[PDB]
Ligand binder design. Structure first.
Ligand SMILES: [Mg+2]
Ligand SMILES: [Zn+2]
Ligand SMILES: [Zn+2]
Ligand SMILES: [Zn+2]
Lengths: 242, 101, 341, 291, 113
């Protein structure tokens, strides 16, 4: 909950707030995903297809959360969950502000949300993310508009989310999105000098904002930055007044 | 044509071969290590018998029971492999028993 | 050190023929296993990336012969060993090639236990079948599909989506989210469906909504313009970054360019088992709509573990009243009521 | 939506109703139903009955739940489920088995118990409804009562030895020794007319290996009817019951048993040479519970 | 026994060359040795004439291999004599040999011809 005029907020809901328990009662044991203690051929493959009448139980991992803010580690059933996932939920909101779209992901199903993450990033990134939790991803025959789409970065993504917007005319004249649009026209190539150095202000701000946005949007749980390191990033260089 | 091989059948045959060759028993204060089944094979060679008597108690000990499960539970499947293993053991030890004589 | 000085020509001047003839009479099973050696050396040379010529030439670097390299004294002028002597060709034998391979530090060998075999046969059926054949026990993929599974195969696959080609038609609605962009804050995957933002009937809405929504955004702009921290707001008034992309205001001025007098449920769910019986799956084929044969609040109840169609009748039900009247269930919360007070 | 063709049964609604019945049934409901409200004791008639039964079956490792059908009449939500179970025993009992598995999984997970879930998931749980409506004898059942859950009561006279009923047919190639394992489907096994191996496609290479197939226990029991109502002039009747895979040899000759099962009819071939069935069907009972 | 060489091919255990060539022990030997002949034979300048002929055949989708009789006679005289002797059993083994040789360079060629 954030008051703009006071300019600060509070985290209110906790009904679904799970408590982490210890890692042990450098990617060898935190995330081969061994949890549930179930980590302890000829003629069959089990990679090209699934059994017709399956006699195996599905993984049971926590799925509590909200559509469209679920992290990759909670989208593919993964035990040994950590606080890192909440960091992902920070980026999506940060992605909602940059692009002016609030419902970032429809996320009708876990598979649907995972394929939504395939469109912005790419099939290979999602498969290499899955290969970390011990799971294999596979998708083919699908008409994706860009294979490995938005590889220049999430920068190009917000730029397209802004392109359709800046061609049809969906933004007002007193808009703030035009600054981001003109800064991505910098990053992508495709008196009154407060104009120039406020120009430099908002451009440096956007340049570092996308850096924190991509640290939040990382597939690897461990190599994803924590809250402390994310707060020490030079985008937030206004903490000296403390 | 490449005939399909029963991998576990071959494994059971090999386990039966080592059971027939290397099995040993401790006598009751009348001798040292004796190989029961090689002695039985040479016995039925001398007396021209056709039947070999395999004790299930002896068979259970070998292969930590893994030969025992497979022979007792899938006997109709592994019987030809047991026959092949016995025939090979006779072919190397006492090779004159493989003919009707 | 043979692993470097010989590996420099390994990538640029390294093309080798494998001989297929045999000098002396041989057995058929032995013929098969020498074919297996020929393939083994083939993929031991292939892994390192060396090119191979099936067609013997004069630009061939090495030949490896099951033929006797040695005893070459008497041979036909057309026989390949004679022309290997003839063009400085590096002539080897399969034993010499195996020695080279062992000196390459590459593995010669690229279920062990009967108990492990029986454990594998407890699942996956038996092994008395062709290893590489459509098992007819596992549903195989032939159409566009998405499949997320466990490589350890310890858990059931999480995602198994298999769409027929006719389902891939009608690109207006796919069974999967193809990225769409959208406008006016739309969820990118959601399109402008039955919405034409270029329709003036729509345009007189968004610009006008922007007119009433103008100064709320002006206040917010002036309050968050110069400093991220809002404690230093009070201090030319408004500054803007120039742009050239057309607008809602620009669109509406265009529509007066073009049209006006001118031309152109509850939140929880029951815990269901994962394994579906064969009979239950078979019953799914026989389903028909309820048109043949035979209070909006509805959802699960974690207290009673029963699903209700009506809240005002679940709370007055027997089990819910019994649960509420029992103070032993509400014990840990009883610590908090008076722990704070 | 999506009810089953030919039945009133809807999988979702029936599953929900049976789960609610299992989670929230107490025997005081039946005591009220039987107009015996003054026998109601708060100690054992106020505990969830089937929750305790599910816990006991989990602890003991058993797989069969004995469901009293009349209990479904006590619960309000399952007043229709009783008629659905009586009218369509096959679909309803399958749904009940699935619901029992879900219920036990929920009992283990929701209460966070220590019990392993691997052996629960791989276990096949079965429901045995017994106390269905007792009337109509056996001779008063019409062809409209075929495939319905009926309740007979009588004396066991005879029982055939254990008959092997093939569930999986094991074929073997006479050429390449490649084997597929066909599954039975409504009593018909699709014999392969070609080796599925791509290497050899010999048409009649496949031969059935009788001793390597998968078999299940089937037994036929001769029962003498002892109905509550006997119409004038009729003589005692004998029927054949079919017990399957755990109920074999559970009834010995001379036993007085009350058996609940499906009233079935099968066409009997006139001769062993040709495939011609008789237009007059033969009636029997597939036993699901023996008391 | 069941596999022969080029030297041992001359000695015929059958009454006539037809039974010799039809004999599987000789048929597989002839097939292997013609497979070798198509691969190894090269011109005096260095060009593998059958190499270029296979590439031309693959690049033109033709089903005719223009095999010469000098090259067979000079390289393998006994097989050229066998071909001149019983050209029905031969040109049936070697057509298969040529198919194998053109499939090695041009895989998945049986679908075309
Ligand atoms: Mg909440
Ligand atoms: Zn993980
Ligand atoms: Zn409740
Ligand atoms: Zn076959």
């Amino acid at each position: 909950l954030f008051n703009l005029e006071l300019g600060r907020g509070v985290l209110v809901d906790f009904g679904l707030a799970e408590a982490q328990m210890d890692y042990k009662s450098n990617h060898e044991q935190f995330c081969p995903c061994i949890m549930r203690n179930q980590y302890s051929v000829n003629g069959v493959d089990l990679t090209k297809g699934y059994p017709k009448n399956e006699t195996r139980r599905i993984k049971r991992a926590n799925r509590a959360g909200t559509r469209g803010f679920r992290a990759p580690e909670v989208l593919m059933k993964c035990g040994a969950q950590s606080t890192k996932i909440d960091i992902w939920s920070v980026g999506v909101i940060l992605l909602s502000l940059l692009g002016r779209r609030f419902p970032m992901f429809q996320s009708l199903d876990d598979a649907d949300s995972l394929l939504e993450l395939c469109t912005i990033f790419g099939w290979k990134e999602l498969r290499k993310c899955a290969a970390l939790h011990g799971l294999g991803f596979e998708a083919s025959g699908l008409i994706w508009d860009k294979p490995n789409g938005y590889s220049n970065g999430l920068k190009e993504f917000v730029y397209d989310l802004l392109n359709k917007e800046c061609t049809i005319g969906t933004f007002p004249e007193y808009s703030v999105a035009f600054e981001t649009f003109g800064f991505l026209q910098q990053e992508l190539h495709d008196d009154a000098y407060e104009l120039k150095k406020y120009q430099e202000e908002i451009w440096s701000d956007h340049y570092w904002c996308f850096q924190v946005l991509e640290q939040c949007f990382e597939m690897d749980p461990q190599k994803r930055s924590s809250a402390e390191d994310l707060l020490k990033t030079p985008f937030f260089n206004e903490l000296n007044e403390n | 044509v490449k005939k399909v091989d029963d991998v576990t059948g071959e494994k059971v045959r090999e386990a039966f071969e080592q059971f027939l060759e290397d099995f040993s028993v401790q006598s009751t204060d009348t001798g040292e290590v004796e190989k029961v089944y090689r002695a039985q094979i040479e016995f039925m060679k001398i007396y021209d018998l056709n039947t070999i008597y395999i004790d299930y108690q002896h068979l259970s000990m070998r292969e930590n029971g893994a030969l025992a499960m497979a022979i007792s539970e899938q006997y109709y499947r592994f019987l030809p492999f047991l026959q092949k293993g016995l025939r090979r053991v006779v072919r190397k030890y006492a090779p004159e028993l493989l003919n009707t004589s | 050190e043979w692993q470097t000085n010989w590996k420099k020509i390994m990538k640029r001047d390294s093309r080798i023929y494998f001989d297929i003839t045999d000098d002396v009479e041989m057995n058929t099973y032995n013929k098969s296993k020498m074919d297996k050696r020929r393939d083994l050396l083939k993929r031991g040379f292939l892994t390192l990336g060396a090119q191979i010529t099936q067609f013997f030439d004069t630009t061939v670097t090495i030949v490896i012969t099951r033929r006797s390299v040695e005893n070459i004294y008497l041979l036909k002028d057309t026989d390949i060993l004679s022309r290997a002597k003839k063009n400085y060709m590096k002539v080897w034998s399969y034993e010499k090639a195996a020695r080279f391979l062992k000196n390459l530090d590459v593995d010669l060998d690229h279920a062990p236990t009967l108990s492990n075999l029986l454990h594998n046969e407890k699942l996956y059926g038996p092994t008395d079948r062709d290893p590489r054949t459509k098992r007819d026990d596992i549903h195989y993929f032939k159409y566009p599909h998405v499949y997320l599974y466990d490589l350890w195969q310890t858990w059931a696959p999480i995602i198994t989506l298999e769409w027929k080609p006719q389902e891939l038609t009608n690109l207006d609605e796919l069974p999967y989210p193809i990225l769409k962009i959208g406008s006016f804050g739309r969820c990118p995957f959601i399109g402008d469906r039955n919405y034409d933002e270029s329709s003036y009937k729509r345009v007189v809405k968004r610009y006008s909504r922007d007119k009433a929504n103008k100064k709320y955004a002006l206040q917010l702009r002036a309050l968050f313009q110069y400093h991220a921290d809002t404690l230093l707001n009070t201090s030319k008034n408004l500054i803007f970054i120039p742009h050239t992309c057309n607008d809602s205001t620009k669109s509406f001025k265009k529509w007066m360019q073009e049209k006006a007098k001118n031309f152109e449920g509850n939140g929880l769910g029951p815990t269901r088992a994962s394994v579906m019986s064969k009979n239950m799956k078979s019953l799914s084929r026989l389903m028909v709509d309820r048109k043949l044969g035979v209070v909006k609040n509805s959802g699960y109840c974690e207290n009673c573990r029963v699903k209700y169609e009506s809240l005002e009748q679940h709370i007055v039900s027997e089990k819910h009243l019994s649960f509420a009247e029992n103070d032993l269930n509400f014990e840990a919360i009883d610590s908090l009521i008076e722990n704070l007070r | 939506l999506r009810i089953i063709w030919g039945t009133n049964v809807s999988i979702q609604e029936c599953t929900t109703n049976f789960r609610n019945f299992l989670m929230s049934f107490k025997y005081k409901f039946r005591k009220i139903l039987d107009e015996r409200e003054e026998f109601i004791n708060n100690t054992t008639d106020e505990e969830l009955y089937y929750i305790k039964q599910l816990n006991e079956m989990r602890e003991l490792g058993t797989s069969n739940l004995n469901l009293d059908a009349r209990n479904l009449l006590a619960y309000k939500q399952t007043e229709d489920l009783y008629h659905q179970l009586l009218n369509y025993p096959q679909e309803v009992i399958s749904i009940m088995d699935q619901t029992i598995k879900d219920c036990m999984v929920s009992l283990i997970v929701d209460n966070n118990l220590d019990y392993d879930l691997d052996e629960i998931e791989t276990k096949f749980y079965k429901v045995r409804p017994y106390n269905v409506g007792s009337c109509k004898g056996m001779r008063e059942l019409n062809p409209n009562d075929i495939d319905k859950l009926i309740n007979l009561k009588g004396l066991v006279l005879r029982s055939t030895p254990v008959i092997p009923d093939m569930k999986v047919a094991f074929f073997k190639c006479n050429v390449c020794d490649h084997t597929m394992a066909v599954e039975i489907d409504r009593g018909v096994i699709q014999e392969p007319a070609r080796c599925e191996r791509i290497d050899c496609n010999e048409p009649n290479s496949m031969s059935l290996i009788h001793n390597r197939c998968s078999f299940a226990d089937k037994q036929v029991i001769k029962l003498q009817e002892t109905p509550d109502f006997v119409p004038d002039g009729q003589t005692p009747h004998s029927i054949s019951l079919c017990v399957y895979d755990e109920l074999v040899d559970s009834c010995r000759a001379g036993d007085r048993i009350e058996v609940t099962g499906t009233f079935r009819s099968i066409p009997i071939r006139a001769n062993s040479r040709q495939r011609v069935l008789k237009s007059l069907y033969k009636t029997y009972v597939d036993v699901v519970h023996v008391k | 026994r069941e596999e022969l060489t080029l030297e041992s091919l001359s000695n015929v255990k059958a009454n006539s060359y037809s039974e010799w060539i039809t004999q599987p022990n000789v048929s597989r030997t002839i097939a292997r040795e013609l497979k070798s002949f198509l691969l190894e034979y090269t011109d005096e300048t260095g060009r593998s004439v059958y190499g270029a002929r296979i590439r031309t055949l693959g690049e033109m989708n033709s089903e005719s291999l223009e095999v010469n009789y000098r090259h067979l006679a000079e390289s393998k005289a006994i097989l050229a004599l066998f071909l001149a002797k019983c050209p029905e059993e031969m040109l049936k083994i070697f057509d298969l040999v040529a198919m194998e040789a053109t499939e090695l360079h041009y895989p998945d060629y049986a679908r075309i011809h």
